[PDB]
């Protein structure tokens, strides 16, 4: 549950393993499920273990999902494994300006 009076930035992740074998080795057998809940957001995640194109040697992927939790609101992680949990939440400080370039700073 969010304490402060600014919105919260929550981020979690799912580990789509290289194969059902690795997924069983890590989180046990049986279908895996991660439901994420919130007053303004509700979704269900099921990992799809498969041998993706081998990026740098590892065929397994970890994807990240995010939500903004308004003040005095609760987020509920019900899960069964294959969950990359967060330790800290993020709170935006003020205002800023983002750019993209390769040129030197001055």
């Amino acid at each position: 549950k969010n304490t402060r009076k600014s919105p919260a930035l929550i981020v979690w992740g799912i580990h789509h393993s290289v194969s059902t074998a690795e997924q069983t080795k890590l989180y046990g057998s049986g279908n895996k499920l991660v439901t994420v809940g919130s007053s303004n957001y509700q979704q269900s995640f099921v990992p799809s273990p498969g041998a993706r194109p081998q990026v740098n040697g590892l065929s397994g992927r970890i994807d990240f999902h995010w939500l903004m939790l308004n003040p005095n609101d609760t987020v509920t992680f019900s899960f069964n494994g294959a969950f990359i949990a967060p330790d800290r939440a993020s709170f935006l400080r003020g205002k800023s300006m983002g750019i993209q370039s390769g040129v030197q700073v001055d």
């Epitope: 194969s19 059902t20 074998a21 690795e22 069983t24 080795k25 890590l26 046990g28 057998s29 590892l58």
Partner: antibody
Framework: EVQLLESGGGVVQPGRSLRLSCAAS????????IHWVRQAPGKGLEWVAL????????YYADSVKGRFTISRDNSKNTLYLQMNSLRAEDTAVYYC????????????????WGQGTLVTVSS | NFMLTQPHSVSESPGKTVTISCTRS????????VQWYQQRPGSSPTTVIY?????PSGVPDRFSGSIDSSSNSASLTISGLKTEDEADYYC?????????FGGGTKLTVLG
Amino acid sequence: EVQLLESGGGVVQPGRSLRLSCAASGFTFSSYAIHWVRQAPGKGLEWVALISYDGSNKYYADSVKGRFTISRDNSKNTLYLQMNSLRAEDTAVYYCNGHGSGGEVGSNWFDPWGQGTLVTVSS
Amino acid sequence: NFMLTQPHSVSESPGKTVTISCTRSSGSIASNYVQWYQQRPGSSPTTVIYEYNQRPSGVPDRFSGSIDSSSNSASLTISGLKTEDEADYYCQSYDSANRVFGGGTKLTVLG
């Protein structure tokens, strides 16, 4: 340099008890889970027991439940198998064998075995 | 829950290829990893294959692992047999946390 040292083997009678120990040296013992795997003479391998890296979980074979009790001392890097209420069939060579991911998922294959300690149970 | 059945014995001439099967009685062979162990007489077992096909550092290229989901089996195959290979071989898979060993397969190279 990595090695496992099984000790406590000998001849016993049925109905009695026994205790086995494994001395680990050469790796981070506190991180891997450890297994007891035996093999009767002329027979094949049989997984006996396992204990987790932090001793929270202990898993025993269905053919040995109730009698054997696994334990570990990480401060001493020692494994213990309590074989009370022995039977005639438990006669076998007893290997301690480390088998676990150890917190890493890349995890080059790490599965060390000892030399095995003979446990003869004749009448 | 399940048992791993492998043939009691097998033999083949040196230089020829040989394969050993490991059939799981209940449950998909792809559900849990399968390790292939080699045990020489008197010696402690040494892993030849892990995670169905992975060759640990030291094992020559002759050893290969395979999975046959159709017959729900796992096969360890050696090409170009050598008399050193004459040992017993055990396949091992996993029930939920417990390990399960095969019945053993005495591989003798023809002399």
